[PDB]
Design an enzyme around this catalytic site. Sequence first.
Site, PDB file in Angstrom:
ATOM      1  N   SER A  86      53.421  39.533  38.332  1.00  0.00           N
ATOM      2  CA  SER A  86      53.252  40.473  39.399  1.00  0.00           C
ATOM      3  C   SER A  86      55.430  40.126  39.077  1.00  0.00           C
ATOM      4  CB  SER A  86      52.795  39.174  41.106  1.00  0.00           C
ATOM      5  OG  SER A  86      53.202  39.899  41.527  1.00  0.00           O
ATOM      6  N   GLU A 141      44.475  45.428  42.401  1.00  0.00           N
ATOM      7  CA  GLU A 141      45.780  45.043  42.751  1.00  0.00           C
ATOM      8  C   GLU A 141      46.263  44.742  43.594  1.00  0.00           C
ATOM      9  OE1 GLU A 141      47.961  43.763  40.516  1.00  0.00           O
ATOM     10  OE2 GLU A 141      47.364  44.680  38.989  1.00  0.00           O
ATOM     11  N   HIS A 170      44.847  40.799  42.326  1.00  0.00           N
ATOM     12  CA  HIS A 170      46.008  40.294  42.438  1.00  0.00           C
ATOM     13  C   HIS A 170      46.414  38.618  41.159  1.00  0.00           C
ATOM     14  CE1 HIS A 170      50.406  41.094  41.809  1.00  0.00           C
ATOM     15  NE2 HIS A 170      50.695  40.584  42.346  1.00  0.00           N
TER      16      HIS A 170
END
Lengths: 534, 531
Positions: free
Chosen positions: B200, B325, B438
Amino acid sequence: REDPQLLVRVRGGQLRGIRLKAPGGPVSAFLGIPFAEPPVGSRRFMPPEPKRPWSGVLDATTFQNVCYQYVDTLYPGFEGTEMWNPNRELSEDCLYLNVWTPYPRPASPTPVLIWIYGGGFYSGAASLDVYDGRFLAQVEGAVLVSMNYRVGTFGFLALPGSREAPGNVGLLDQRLALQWVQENIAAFGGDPMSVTLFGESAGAASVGMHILSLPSRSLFHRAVLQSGTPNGPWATVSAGEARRRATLLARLVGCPGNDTELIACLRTRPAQDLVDHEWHVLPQESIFRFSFVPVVDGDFLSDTPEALINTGDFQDLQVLVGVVKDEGSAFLVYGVPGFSKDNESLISRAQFLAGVRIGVPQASDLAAEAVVLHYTDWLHPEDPTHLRDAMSAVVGDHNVVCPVAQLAGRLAAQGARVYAYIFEHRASTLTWPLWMGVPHGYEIEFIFGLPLDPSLNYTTEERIFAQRLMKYWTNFARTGDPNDPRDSKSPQWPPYTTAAQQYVSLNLKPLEVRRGLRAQTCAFWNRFLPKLLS
Amino acid sequence: EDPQLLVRVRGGQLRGIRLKAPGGPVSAFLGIPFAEPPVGSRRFMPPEPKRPWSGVLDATTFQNVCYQYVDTLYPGFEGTEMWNPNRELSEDCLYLNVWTPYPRPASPTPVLIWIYGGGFYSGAASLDVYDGRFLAQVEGAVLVSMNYRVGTFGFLALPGSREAPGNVGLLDQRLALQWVQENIAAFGGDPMSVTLFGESAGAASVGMHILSLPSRSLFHRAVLQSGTPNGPWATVSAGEARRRATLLARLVGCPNDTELIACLRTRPAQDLVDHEWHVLPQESIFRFSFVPVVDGDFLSDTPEALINTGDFQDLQVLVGVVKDEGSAFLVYGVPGFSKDNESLISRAQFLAGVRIGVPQASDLAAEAVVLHYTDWLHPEDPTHLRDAMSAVVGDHNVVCPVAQLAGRLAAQGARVYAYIFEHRASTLTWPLWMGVPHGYEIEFIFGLPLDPSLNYTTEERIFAQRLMKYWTNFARTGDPNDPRDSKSPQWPPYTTAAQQYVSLNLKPLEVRRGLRAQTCAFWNRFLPKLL
Ligand SMILES: Nc1ccc2c(c1)c(-c1ccccc1)[n+](CCCCCCc1cn(CCNc3c4c(nc5ccccc35)CCCC4)nn1)c1cc(N)ccc21
Ligand SMILES: Nc1ccc2c(c1)c(-c1ccccc1)[n+](CCCCCCc1cn(CCNc3c4c(nc5ccccc35)CCCC4)nn1)c1cc(N)ccc21
Ligand SMILES: *[C@@H]1O[C@H](CO)[C@@H](O)[C@H](O)[C@H]1NC(C)=O
Ligand SMILES: *[C@@H]1O[C@H](CO)[C@@H](O)[C@H](O)[C@H]1NC(C)=O
């Protein structure tokens, strides 16, 4: 004395027809019946006037003149083009229609099918081989009618608001022939209360315009639209654009300031002079655009076709609509650089971007980039075969498939019973190259039943296939439903709806039901692209 | 006194702790200071190197977590709490951690350096999912992770000022990287084989070190997981950082730059965090208040300009995405979405959710998005609209930026390997409709399933072993393929022509082509033209 079965009276006067041979036996044909005063002289550009009665027996045994028009020269001697060219003398005196009936004529009133030819409103003839009514008449017991109607300037040149050139006279010719069927078809054993219009390309667009124009609605009960719609980017022009084109053509031929004087001057011009300059009035380099087409007059068309399909009430209406697998392919050789019938037409990415501007000429920089981005295979962005096929699809989708999708959806949302098809069979006898697949116009020979003539060299399967198709179309003409009531087991053709979007494949295989008519791509053209043209 | 647990670094002596890993012992050195505490007058300033110390520094426990927002949407729920700070919060947080094999490796070993995520507003190197124990033990790797400053403390910028130049959180990371060059040999690490990896915001950070000259001499290879330096959330312009800073200062009663920063420096840490969220220009998700700034310094130009023109010829990169995601972000602002129900949304809610997922989108731009992601066969199906809203957010923020980076690096001489991770952890506490959210690959890369007590399946253990091998093969050689196994299916490099990437899941590697190519063309080529 003459065959007693070939003498018929209409409003009109006496007709003598001819006994024709069809594979399964004889049919009656009445060819070249006049339905209007010859639209010549002071009468060019004017609405048609009903034909005055004649004396004696009019001979109705041969096709009559084809309306004055452009003759295609791109491929001399090539069946692919010549089959669409005029097969009778060109004359402005061309307002004649044709009737095919069973022989002997049916005892009880028979469903009537009225064909309206295509040719982009600049060409066409009811006398072409692929429009031969003998097969439907002999095999299905149908009464089949087809009319010549003025094309190009003669039919569609308009100075909107004038008396002398009001526009849409070609459509008015069609309307008159439909009025003629109402008054007279019963003399041939046809049922005037069961009249189905069908047509392809501009003929389809014409049929659609009769659905949308109130004075035409009393003249038919059902409608079939093949590979054409009255909405879309080619079938109509604004009043302003029609004025612009007529004015420009007027100057190209030495006609300079009110409308009367201009139109009078156009009327003194030789027919061939007008055809010779017809093409020069198009606003951009383009394909699938035609100079003289139906105009939004606020009369025949009270508003744009788009507006009339969004707000119309279509409860009592039954329509069969559909498209061929490759609507755009054959247009590409008429002005996209890189395309030819004589090679594989593998193009470069540059030739593709140039093609898009020509295929979508309306069509800003942003809008074109959107088309290109949508039709690019981002896995193989340079592949010439995919580029070739995308160019074809772009032109096919933009001009036919998506305008048809829009039509089917709007009609179905507003009460109509709609049946939809995609025609996917390539005639074994086609002379266009293989890469063009199933081009615009190449279902017609199957609907009309040409393969039934053993001398034309279609395969046995094609012969059976054509019989299936003729059965669908005439079941539809009869009942508003292409399906067979008796034939339970055969797969059913369901109505197209907004909820399920069902349509059928027409090919050598039994019916297959599919869902969504290029739904994703047509959302791009019908929903999105308008919005980035604000 | 275990001699294996006693190391001399430039600044003095350290005592580590022998930790247990399922296969055997590892040596851990936790809470090593790499900078002067960035406190008092040093708030918002570049980190200074840590002064040397006397005697033996105790390095047996994790040190404080950098001052940050603590999540409070679902209190006590595993799925959120697992990302929350697990140590005390302090501005005094510039420490790093080293895991090494026990005994310390005989010959120099490849070094992996982890840079955590959390949108540049949160995160910590001490989280259970970043436990370097397993990689050290099974693969013989030296694993390093640093804390770096987040939110206002790490990224509040008044660009061109001396006292708040911006990007200091990235300078914290750079300093830890420098520390590794100077010190890692003492632990048996090879300073000549350093691979950065991150997820990330940690992935975006890795990418910023790729794009910043002074960081380049500090590592050789890079892994960017679910994140990129380019794209809509990872940077802000100088002009926009200045506005947010000014706004924050006004929101806390402050006050020229010097004066404004001085007042900000008087404020208790929690006061800054209290108002951090109100500086965002729009109702939005996947947007963060204080993130790296295009300063003309650390970042000479936008990451977009820099990736388009950079020379990446002696560079090897592993990049990828997870299957869903954007699913988990939706519950953080989009009306209609909750973890506690199936989140079956209406069309209206979809159009409204797009304006929030793509906050910078005009009416026309948002229309294009809606029209692209609607399924025209089922335009009103709640399940489709729900999954599409997710997709919008995931594609816009992660998948397509990853696709752009990958193509750009490949075209410009880098060696690129790409993946899509598709296995949902059996132990996941987020609902099924979120799929593989995510952050939920990290677990596996770090090798947690190898701990019997965590209740992962047998399959899951074997799978994490495969993954640890790809990452470390990649660290070792720049190629994730196992050089001993003379069987397929080989993981091919990603290229602009072929666009090959691999599915990471319980089944053997599958090679796929084109990473959402049609959709990313929409996001990368078309959407910018609308603006
Ligand atoms: N240099 C000139 C001068 C004048 C004209 C020229 C060119 C052209 C032109 C010819 C070749 C290439 C580019 C332009 N044109 C344009 C002719 C091109 C129009 C399209 C031809 C086409 C192609 N298709 C698809 C395949 N099937 C058909 C056709 C044709 N007709 C039909 C009719 C109904 C259904 C199908 C069908 C006719 C031709 C070939 C295929 N339909 N129509 C003119 C037109 C005018 N009205 C007047 C003058 C001129
Ligand atoms: N009323 C307020 C006041 C202040 C803040 C508020 C709300 C919010 C907020 C909370 C719920 C709904 C809307 C807004 N927020 C927003 C925080 C939520 C933003 C992102 C949450 C998220 C969701 N995911 C996906 C799933 N996995 C993760 C996470 C989290 N972190 C990470 C870190 C690395 C990898 C994965 C990962 C944290 C949260 C949950 C899941 N990542 N991040 C604040 C933020 C600040 N910096 C400061 C103040 C506030
Ligand atoms: C096909 O022929 C046309 C004109 O004769 C030409 O423009 C085009 O380059 C040719 N295509 C190929 C693939 O050779
Ligand atoms: C059909 O095939 C025959 C050969 O048996 C040939 O003589 C004839 O020319 C063909 N007809 C057409 C219309 O192509």
